[model samples]
Target chain A: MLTIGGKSFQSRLLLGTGKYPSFDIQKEAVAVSESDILTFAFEASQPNFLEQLDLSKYTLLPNTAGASTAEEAVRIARLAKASGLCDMIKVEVIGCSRSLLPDPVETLKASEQLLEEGFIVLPYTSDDVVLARKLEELGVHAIMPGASPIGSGQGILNPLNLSFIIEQAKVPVIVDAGIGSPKDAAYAMELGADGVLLNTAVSGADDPVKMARAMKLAVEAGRLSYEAGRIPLKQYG
Target chain B: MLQLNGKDVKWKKDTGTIQDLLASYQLENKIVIVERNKEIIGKERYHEVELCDRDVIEIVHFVG
Candidate 1:
């Protein structure tokens, strides 16, 4: 079982509710993904949007994507909790507009405050082993490191750094963003990531539903292989 | 006049509760969080919380 903040989840895949062709397709893809958790962004209320899905089915994780500062991110997290939706918050303080990488300074600040407020914090950060260690020390329930620049589909840009983070992490390490396909997701799992959070990889695929199923199998297979152990790299092999 | 979701809107309704304001925008039944003057107003208090002039209110909901 994959556990984060003391909550157990049967599925290790966490899907984002974005980028699908239609609500119908997204719903179908979500069902196929078999993900027990879903991520959402904080936005002004739009009529019929929330009505499209039954929110009770999955554990909701609201992300503060647009917030550029610690104060703004904290505010959004509070609003998410006030809505009686979910207590889990994905702290995303994007530093660069082009890369969409997290600002380690602001992320640390926001995570500290959120932890004080007693909310389950899952921060999205770069594949910096030191930063991942710092966030873990600050008591984040999960440390989410990007495989590459967001939406770039460039998988595992720095596997060595990611490996160090995963190896050193005391809590769950969720590989978030930059996953372009099932192979990318499988690679992250094989590298010992506790879970994978994907959006564009599945939602933006040629067939989202089919890709979602593929991702499910890939994650399971990769996890099984990791537990099963792999052969050491050899020059002859 | 009051601010709602960072926009200025004229408060024209006779009943000025947060519930009324949400109804004006056709969002009474939607799952939303209301913040008045930098404070989160509980959903249970939406009907009792009265609006005032120059009040800043933010209404947000989930959008993935």
Candidate 2:
């Protein structure tokens, strides 16, 4: 089981409800993915998008995706809390639009304030070892390091940096954003990440439902491999 | 007149409940969070609380 901020989940694969061709497909993919946690964003009311799914099934992790400043992130987090949905907040403060890397300073400030308000904070950050340490020290429940730029699907450009974070983190280390394939998710788990959060790789696939199933298996396989402790590399004589 | 979701909207009524305001937008049954002047109003109290002119109202819901 994956335990996050006192709540335990059987599945370590966290799913995002974005980029799916249709709501029906998204729902089907979600069921197959077996992820207990779902991340969503807030928007001005129109035709209610949530009417298609039964929200009671999953723990909601509303994100501050478009917020670039700490104050905006805090406001969005507070508004999400007011909805009485869930306390878990995926604090995202994108520093740039081109690269979509998180601003370490703004992210830290947002996480700190959210923690003070008693929200379970999980920040989406870059693969910076020092920043991860700072977020953990500020009492965040988890440290989410992106493998690459959001939606880039570059897949673990720097595994060593991710390893550094996993080595030091006392809380769950969830690799969020930029996952391209099942192998990417597996790689994160093999490197000791506690969970994997992804969207486009599954939702944008030609066969999203099948890809979701693949992701589920990959996460489990990788986790098993990590627990089993693969043999060390030996130099060829 | 009221600023709603960062846009100017006309709430033409002397005084009415949030339920009435939501009904105008056809959002009475939708799962949403309604904030009036920055304070979130509970769904149960949508009919109890009253809205005034120039009030800032923000109605939002979850999306992907």
Candidate 3:
């Protein structure tokens, strides 16, 4: 599938760079995942830390996972653009609690500012259908709806709601967070989600490299199935 | 003269608006940002933002 920001990517699978034990392992997992886009959090650990990473193989998508407000997300977006790693920012304005549920109000605000600043913004939000529609109205490049709480690994707790989101969304719908297995990724794509993004599912596995590969295959199979179309189920049976 | 994306451009003395100047190069929407003397002109104002002789203009675009 084609990338959202006017760029072209051969693979539809999107990979996360978080949760790996080390950067080297993370790099290896990314390679194994065969993902065209590599997503990571925006941390102030050191200036230009993202630049230090060897990212020639993938397009970088820096996320505002830790930011609690729209202003913070905007600042992080500016910093990421300045570092030259990405012109697109994943706006994840979340509450202070550990649940990491997306704050929709703050997300819309952050997305507006970032878009004005010439950065393509893909906002992460809850699977609320209305919220997804609102984000689409705000002119975001894409909308990423969480499958569940971040790192919860509670695979598709509400398939009905997620399906509603996929049906209603105007832009690409990426199922993000809380995916526990390849099946979860497959199911998301089968439900017509544009893509799936996960960190804990792969990194938490005993063999992250292997899990990454499996996830890639699962995503592809799911996409193919969705495109091929499925036969209607027989309710009487 | 004007500076566009860090390169100097021969500024026409009669160039009125940023849009008109950009039209000569046919750079309507290929990939660009316009700045006049260090201040970023708003996208809406690009059509109205007039350029004067010797005013520095910066245009940045992505090239892969």
Candidate 4:
């Protein structure tokens, strides 16, 4: 079982609530996914955003998606708390729009305060080895490094950095964002990632429900393969 | 006039409180957030809060 913040998760895959054609499709995707944890931006900007998605069965993750600075991020997190949405906040300090890369500085700053306030801090950062080590040192429950830009589905663009993170991070290292396909998730786990977090890959799929099933299977397969220990690579094989 | 979810509406006679406004819109049963002038109104105190002209009321909810 994957443990983070003194809790055991039933599923290694984590689902995101965004980019679906409709709320019905999004709900069905969550139902079909093996993921016991569901993540969503607190600034949903819709009237049914809270009503449509029932949070009865899953661990709800409230992300500071629209925040641009540490203060903004913390403020949004507190709003999420005040709204009674969740105690776990995904610290996403995104400074850039096009690339959607995380600002590690603000992320660390916000996670520090969030940890002090008794919230589970799951920071989304770039695939930087040093930054991942720093986040682990800051007592974060998990460190999420983006595989690529959000909704881009570019897969792992920085394999070496991800390797460094998985090898050295004390907490769970779930690869978040830019996962284009199930094979991409499987490959990430092959590199020793604890879990995979994705949204558009499944939600924007031609068939979201079926894609959710595929993601669950792929996550399980990747986890199994990682545990069994795949063969080492060789030169001129 | 007040901005309720981006649409301006003339304040109604019975829509003095948040509860009354929600009842008027038929959204009383739905779980939602009521932000009046950038301040969040707790659901428990919905009846105690009063609506005003140009309040810029912003409401949002969670969906799957």
Candidate 5:
């Protein structure tokens, strides 16, 4: 089991319940993936959304996805805490709605306050070593840097950049967003990434249940291979 | 009447409090978080806060 902030989880692959056709399908996918952490984004008002899912079986990682400013992010974080549903949160600050990229400046502002406020924060960030280090310095439990634009399914577009982030990050560096296939997860693990947080990859699949099963197996296999250590390449055979 | 979740609707003067407003929308029993003019209305204070005509309201919740 992976332990952080006194919380233990067996599955390294975290799943997102977004994009599922129904609550039943999402529940089935969670069961198939065998994920211990289920990530979600929320706002306060619609009501009755939480009751539809089986939240007891997994550790809920609430996200601040729609928040575009530090103030909004902080407000959402506080709302999550007051809800008493879960303590851990994923901070996502998108500066622009078109590209939907994270605002590093706003993120730091929010993370700093949230950490001091006694919440276990995992910031969804870009593959920037400087930003990751800053967030780590602020005592965030983990950093979730996107491999590509969220929900784009680009799948680890720049391994070199991702490698740089992994090298500098002391806390868990979960490769998040734009994972198209299981190979992408394995590749991220091979690069020394602690884990991955994905949603669209499985939810948008033709058979989401099967994809869930595949992601579950892939993460384990990837971790095993990473631990086993790959052989070095030779110039000549 | 003002914009509520981007929709223009008639405001009921009798629905003075957030609790009354929620019931008007048929969202009384659901797990909801009400934002009255950019401020989060805590569940405990729903009855204390009053709704005003033309007050902007934002409502959001999770969905899979």
Candidate 6:
């Protein structure tokens, strides 16, 4: 439906470009996933790693993964812009020492700055309706509310909040993080989310390519079902 | 001598600008984000930004 930076993505699934065993395997998994957009952290430490690979085919979304503050996020945005990748950014402001949960306040701060810098900001935050509204007001391209923790594989822990986020979000609602299966992705899409962003779910699986294919199909099915309108739940049957 | 992304390199008189340092490593045409001593140098000044001893410089490439 909606396009980001002139790229039309039929499927709204955003794929992560980390944790794969090898580049070849990652490429295979990406191919299988049919994801139009991919995410990666822009680091200034490894030039050779990016030099050896070619990423001109898919839309690259550089994330501010290690930036804990708004200033750091802005610096990373400049770096990413210099790298000539897509202008879209995933502003991740994680402050917790152990759990690495999103700091809603810091995330909002970074989103505002990034938006001011003319970036298509997609802040990854908790499934809080108020926080989602705040992010929308900050002018982010989308809101990637987490389904659960980053990589706990726990799946969607709170369906109520996730559904509320989908309903309340003004921009596209992408369920990011903590998804462990195609069923989880499908469920999110069926709940009326615009798309899903999953990583560990496919890479951590035994058969990553197979799982990628399954998730792609599940996304398609769920999106079609959402558009077609599903049957109402039976109260008494 | 400065460590470029952890690789020790002797600073030759010819290695004055960021472009020269990248040329020494044959990293020209590679998409890179260069930071010299915590200061981000603009691409237009890559050839004019000089390197100093013990100055930490990082070059990140665009991957994925």
Rate residue A206 of model 6 by lDDT: 69
Candidate 6: where are CA atoms >4 Å away?
A5-7, A42-56, B1-10, B26-31, B42-56, B61-64
Relative to the real complex, the DockQ score for model 6 comes to 0.36
Model 6 docking grade: acceptable
Model 6 chain A lowest lDDT segment of ten: A42-51
TM-score of 5: 0.85
Q: Give one digit per residue, the lDDT tens place, for model 3 in B1-64.
A: 6656556567655657888876777666444456577555645566677877567765544211
Which pairs clash inside model 4?
Answer: A49-B61, A49-B62, A49-B63, A50-B61, A50-B62, A50-B63
How does residue A11 of candidate 2 score in lDDT? 90
Model 1: residue B50 alpha-carbon error in angstroms: 1.4
Question: lDDT of each prediction vs. the true structure?
Answer: 0.85, 0.86, 0.76, 0.83, 0.81, 0.79
Candidate 4, A41: how far from true, in Å? 1.8
DockQ of each: 0.58, 0.55, 0.02, 0.29, 0.32, 0.36
Error of 5 at A54 (Å): 3.6
lDDT of 6 at A123: 83
lDDT of 2 by residue, A1-237 (tens): 788899888899999988898877887898999998989883354444466667777888889977889988888888787767677999899888788889989999888888987899999988889899998998888899999999779899999999999999899999998999989999999999899999999999989999999999999999999988798888897
TM-score values for chain B across all models = 0.85, 0.84, 0.70, 0.83, 0.81, 0.77
* B1-64 per-residue lDDT for model 2 (tens digits): 7777867767665677888887777667777778888777876676778877678777766566
True contacts kept of each: 0.73, 0.64, 0.00, 0.27, 0.32, 0.32
Candidate 2 lDDT for residue A48: 44
| Pairs of colliding residues, candidate 3 | B3-B57, B5-B59
Expressed as tens digits, the lDDT of each residue in A1-237 for candidate 1 is: 889999899899999987788878887898999998998883354444456767777888889888999988988888887778687989999879788999989999889989997899999999889999999898888899999988789888889999999889889999998898878898998989889998998888979999999999988988888988798887763
Pick by TM-score: 4 or 5, better one: 4
Cα-based lDDT at residue A233, candidate 4: 79
Q: Worst ten-residue run, lDDT, model 4 chain A?
A: A42-51
Ranking by DockQ: 1, 2, 6, 5, 4, 3
TM-score of each prediction? 0.93, 0.93, 0.73, 0.86, 0.85, 0.87
Q: After superposition, how far is residue A170 of candidate 5 from its true place, in Å?
A: 2.5
Model 6 per-residue lDDT at A163: 89
In model 2 chain B, where is the ten-residue run with the lowest total lDDT? B6-15
**Residue A68, model 2, lDDT:** 84
